[PDB]
């Protein structure tokens with residue numbers, strides 16, 4: 001039979017009133033022998049009906065795929081409400097069911113530290129600048145880099161990972177050409193997360 | 208139905224002969240009535256016979272997991288020989304087969320740098336020493352922390368991260384306490400990797 005996938009809102013959508021956070025329920029591998037798919041949404045037990053269900057799109061398997069999308073309220077998601085996608089189809093013996101939410105626990109405030117490049121990286125052409133983010137819970141974050149109010153292109157950010165305390169941490173490595181660091185250009189690590197004041201902090205690094 | 212995964216040896220294991228690099232074939236969702244499970248292992252198309260089907264256990268899934276591990280040689284796995292776990296079963300339609308190998312690509316030597324604690328981490332009790340390993344390929348790697356010969360225990364390690372130049376990087380956060388740093392203890396990041404001379408180097412860090 002068919003398979004269901006329940007996708008959450010990207011982190012930054014739930015921290016800015018500017019954005020629109022949503023949950024996407026996706027049914028894949030729907031057949032022509034009955035491609036009637038029915039969506040029932042529930043938040044925290046009680047069913048909602050404010051979901052927008054796109055029409056079936058057949059794929060190149062020769063299989064149908066249906067996407068229902070439910071907008072959330074930022075406070076709802078951050079107050080840890082559970083969202084149930086329920087999928088009905090006359091093939092399936094029993095309706096498939098999915099619950100989703102942010103990961104249960106107590107919010108823990110991240111601590112950001114910026115580390116200048118190691119002295120030995122001076123002998124190369126492009127030095128690495130480091131942003132360490134520690135002690136945050138849950139793990140959905142957002143990290144990136146700006147220099148003079150404008151984003152920096154060349155940085156990779158490692159995923160979050162469970163520390164010994166049960167909270168998370170990460171690093172992001174921004175690679176700049178040796179000159180821009182030498183001159184004293186100020187660089188800037190910004191992070192977004194529920195347990196920050198106004199969901200935003202930023203620390204800067206410069207020679 | 209019987210689903211098959213096949214996991215490669217541990218990085219540390221292939222770079223030091225003291226250890227036993229092993230390829231571990233794992234079958235899942237094996238149901239009581241047909242659990243004979245064959246295994247046959249092949250190397251570069253041929254076949255050798257130094258396998259060892261270990262014992263089993265049981266999850267809350269009404270099913271068990273047979274697990275067979277094969278001993279490998281350190282100069283064959285690192286030379287990119289393909290490894291094949293045929294898993295014959297009558298519960299299965301047919302012989303589900305699988306094949307793994309070391310990732311191909313000219314190995315590249317890792318860059319190892321040691322990041323001392325940011326000034327503003329000094330407010331709080333514990334301090335976090337950073338180690339940055341970057342520019343390595345393939346992604347298999349092992350990092351460890353030690354002080355004056357004995358291994359440190361309070362560290363964590365990011366997974367390899369694919370950068371931009373097709374190299375990988377990673378970080379390591381060894382948490383050392385207040386005064387061990389501040390007194391003058393030397394801490395050391397040790398990296399083991401395919402392309403390192405003697406598959407191992409080390410980098411120090413004192414205040």
Ligand SMILES: *[C@@H]1O[C@H](CO[C@@H]2O[C@@H](C)[C@@H](O)[C@@H](O)[C@@H]2O)[C@@H](O[C@@H]2O[C@H](CO)[C@@H](O[C@@H]3O[C@H](CO[C@H]4O[C@H](CO)[C@@H](O)[C@H](O)[C@@H]4O[C@@H]4O[C@H](CO)[C@@H](O)[C@H](O)[C@H]4NC(C)=O)[C@@H](O)[C@H](O[C@H]4O[C@H](CO)[C@@H](O)[C@H](O)[C@@H]4O[C@@H]4O[C@H](CO)[C@@H](O)[C@H](O)[C@H]4NC(C)=O)[C@@H]3O)[C@H](O)[C@H]2NC(C)=O)[C@H](O)[C@H]1NC(C)=O
Pocket residue numbers: 003005007008024026028029059060061063
């Ligand atoms: C026939 O084809 C169809 C259609 O596919 C398309 O058309 C064909 C013709 C080909 O061209 C295809 O190449 C083409 O893609 C196939 O349909 C596919 O079906 C598979 C399932 O067999 C689905 O795989 C799952 O993928 C999800 C993640 O999917 C995201 O990322 C994809 C690429 O990165 C992207 O293509 C998807 O659209 C989707 O993208 C996200 O979409 C949301 C909603 O809009 C959006 O908000 C996101 O921003 C967006 N993200 C990105 C990056 O784009 C993955 O989660 C699944 O893995 C889980 O399940 C596995 C077991 O099923 C398990 O082994 C994994 O380890 C993992 O397990 C999960 O683990 C997590 C924690 O890690 C846990 O929380 C979960 O509980 C656990 N899961 C379970 C079930 O327990 C899975 O890999 C494809 O999405 C789907 N393709 C598309 C395009 O949707 C079909 O299979 C083909 N059939 C045959 C027989 O050939």
Ligand SMILES: *[C@@H]1O[C@H](CO[C@@H]2O[C@@H](C)[C@@H](O)[C@@H](O)[C@@H]2O)[C@@H](O[C@@H]2O[C@H](CO)[C@@H](O[C@@H]3O[C@H](CO[C@H]4O[C@H](CO)[C@@H](O)[C@H](O)[C@@H]4O[C@@H]4O[C@H](CO)[C@@H](O)[C@H](O)[C@H]4NC(C)=O)[C@@H](O)[C@H](O[C@H]4O[C@H](CO)[C@@H](O)[C@H](O)[C@@H]4O[C@@H]4O[C@H](CO)[C@@H](O)[C@H](O)[C@H]4NC(C)=O)[C@@H]3O)[C@H](O)[C@H]2NC(C)=O)[C@H](O)[C@H]1NC(C)=O
Pocket residue numbers: 210212214215231233235236266267268270272
């Ligand atoms: C009944 O229970 C068992 C046991 O599960 C455990 O207990 C149950 C009861 C629950 O409590 C679970 O929460 C718990 O996990 C169930 O068995 C599980 O089955 C699922 C899928 O059905 C497996 O997911 C796969 O995961 C592997 C990686 O698994 C490692 O990590 C797991 C956790 O992260 C860990 O639990 C495993 O033990 C395993 O650990 C490894 O063990 C070996 C042993 O020697 C060791 O050497 C390793 O070092 C060690 N590693 C770690 C990190 O621990 C993953 O490989 C699979 O993903 C591939 O395949 C998917 C499709 O099957 C696909 O979605 C993925 O994207 C990915 O696809 C591959 O991608 C590559 C490149 O990306 C591509 O080239 C391939 O073509 C592609 N292959 C495809 C598409 O097929 C997969 O996600 C669980 O691991 C497994 N758990 C255990 C413990 O075995 C069982 O399913 C249950 N039955 C029912 C009916 O529910």
